[PDB]
A paper describes a structure:
Brachyury is a transcription factor that plays an essential role in tumour growth of the rare bone cancer chordoma and is implicated in other solid tumours. Brachyury (encoded by the TBXT gene, also formerly known as T) is the founding member of the family and was first identified in 19275. All T-box proteins recognize a common consensus sequence named the T-box binding element (AGGTGTGAAA) with family member-specific variations found in the preferences for repeats, orientations (inverted or tandem), and spacing of such repeats.
We have also obtained a crystal structure of WT brachyury (at 2.7 Å resolution) in complex with a single T-box binding element half-site oligo which allows us to directly compare binding interfaces and DNA distortions between single and palindromic sites.
Author numbering: 41 to 221
DNA sequence: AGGTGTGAGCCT
DNA sequence: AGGCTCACACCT
């Protein structure tokens, strides 16, 4: 049937172990790693749209204390619900199935910025969630799919240097800093 | 054009 | 210190 698997899920888990962190900024920040998924079991000729949002992973604020993540408290008023529609939407199942669906251009921010942006609240842990929707009649239908490997804490600066190291290692745009010699 | 971390600078 | 921001020199 409909199956949706995470591409490069293992890079996500490598980050998860160390407690993953995603920078947000005022102008909005791209994710690394990028969320990419494989889809199967769609109707090749049906029309679907893909949506992405972020759900709170627990109720505590967090803080980094001497090389370790520890909870804080007082979860600031939950962030406004935002969503990002994949720019290829709407499109045929064939298109969504022919190659991994990658959310490379979504931008995460800490301000009520608009235009394909998701506002997160800093020092909170969030989980990406992907949705598939089909408008029709009997085939009317929305799925949601979570990937615990991709949980992360929003931050305005990296805190675990080991995370920064992995970011620099794999994100091509930080390749200039990977001059590790 | 457009994304990346690093320092530096800022307020509390 | 502790969190947020902005120029910048790199990269794509």
């Amino acid at each position: 049937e409909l199956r949706v698997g995470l591409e490069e899920s293992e890079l996500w888990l490598r980050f998860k172990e160390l407690t993953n962190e995603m920078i947000v900024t005022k102008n909005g920040r791209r994710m690394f790693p990028v969320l990419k998924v494989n889809v199967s079991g769609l109707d090749p000729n049906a029309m679907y749209s893909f949506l992405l949002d972020f759900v709170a992973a627990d109720n505590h604020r967090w803080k980094y204390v001497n090389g370790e993540w520890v909870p804080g408290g007082k979860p600031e008023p939950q962030a406004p619900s935002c969503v990002y529609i994949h720019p290829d939407s709407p499109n045929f199942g064939a298109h969504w199935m022919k190659a991994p669906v990658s959310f490379s251009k979504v931008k995460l921010t800490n301000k009520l910025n608009g235009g394909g942006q998701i506002m997160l609240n800093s020092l909170h842990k969030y989980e990406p969630r992907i949705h598939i929707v089909r408008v029709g009649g009997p085939q009317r239908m929305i799925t949601s799919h979570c990937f615990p490997e991709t949980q992360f804490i929003a931050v305005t600066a990296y805190q675990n240097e080991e995370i920064t190291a992995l970011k620099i290692k794999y994100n091509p745009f930080a390749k200039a800093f990977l001059d590790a010699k």
